[PDB]
């Protein structure tokens, strides 16, 4: 219908005029007057933003810095001033050095192949020793590389449906005092208290049956020193996101 389209266009134009009325700082029931005032305001103030503003806009969002390296030698031709707030390093340190020196000494095989037409790699550089990972991205021009650099008690133990140890986090060396290897391959029922297996068996048969809901139970675990301690567990069955099948039981053997 022509009338509906015309009405929609008129309403859109009126809304835009109302918005421009508030946008102009100087400004008033009019349309020609408001347009003239907007033009006059715009007189005081080719691309929408100058090249000096896009840099700030990109730095605020991506939170990165521009660096330049030479393929033949790897010397840092230029580093943006924003390197200091990111890596806490003065421009002097980065300048005049080699990019291979500013990375931990096992990822050199990546940069060596990358530098020697688009480039993109993930590496780690020293933080003036804490190491951080930055997603370097950029292109290659006449031969030099230009690329901005962006930025980013208890022990979990899986189980089988029967109750076998299919995983042991490294924290078990201290939380329970047993080496991870020893616990693997043995049912969790054996390590339980002499006569407490009923509670654990019921909990294991219920966690797999109650449509996968978290359960909590307390028992008396043993230790290499032959002492009884109360450690709680939080058991819930993992489910495949798509197929929706039982993968394993995740138990967090929290210690009281």
């Amino acid at each position: 219908n022509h009338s509906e389209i015309e009405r929609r266009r008129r309403n859109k134009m009126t809304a835009y005029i109302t918005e421009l009325s508030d946008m102009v700082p100087t400004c008033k029931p009019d349309k020609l007057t408001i347009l003239r005032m907007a033009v006059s305001h715009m007189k005081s103030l080719p691309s929408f933003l100058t090249d000096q503003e896009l840099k700030h806009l990109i730095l605020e969002a991506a939170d990165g810095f521009l660096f330049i390296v030479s393929c033949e030698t790897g010397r840092v031709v230029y580093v943006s001033d924003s390197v200091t707030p990111v890596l806490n390093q003065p421009q002097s340190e980065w300048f005049g050095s080699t990019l291979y020196d500013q990375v931990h000494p096992d990822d050199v095989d990546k940069l060596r192949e990358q530098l020697s037409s688009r480039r993109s790699f993930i590496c780690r550089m020293r933080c003036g020793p804490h190491f951080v990972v930055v997603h370097c991205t950029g292109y290659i021009k006449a031969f030099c590389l230009v690329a901005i650099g962006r930025l980013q008690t208890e022990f979990i133990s899986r189980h089988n449906i029967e109750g076998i140890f299919t995983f042991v986090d490294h924290r078990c060396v201290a939380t329970v005092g047993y080496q991870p290897q020893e616990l693997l391959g043995k049912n969790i029922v054996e390590f339980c208290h002499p006569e407490d297996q009923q509670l654990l068996r019921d909990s294991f048969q219920q966690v797999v049956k109650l449509k996968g809901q978290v359960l909590s139970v307390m028992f008396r675990f043993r230790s290499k020193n032959q002492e009884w301690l109360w450690m709680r567990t939080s058991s819930f069955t993992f489910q495949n996101p798509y197929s929706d099948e039982i993968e394993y039981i995740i138990c967090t053997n929290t210690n009281v």
């Binding site: 929408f48 896009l54 806009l57 990109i58 521009l66 991205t137 901005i148």
Partner: peptide, 30 residues
């Protein structure tokens, strides 16, 4: 500022400012 125009070309994406009403008040030229 001597080497500033290279910022946009080096970046592999495109900036896009979005207001709270969903309006896009600026999109990168690239």
């Amino acid at each position: 500022q001597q080497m500033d125009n290279l910022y946009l070309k080096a970046l592999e994406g495109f900036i896009a400012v979005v207001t709270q009403d969903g309006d896009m008040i600026f999109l990168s030229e690239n």
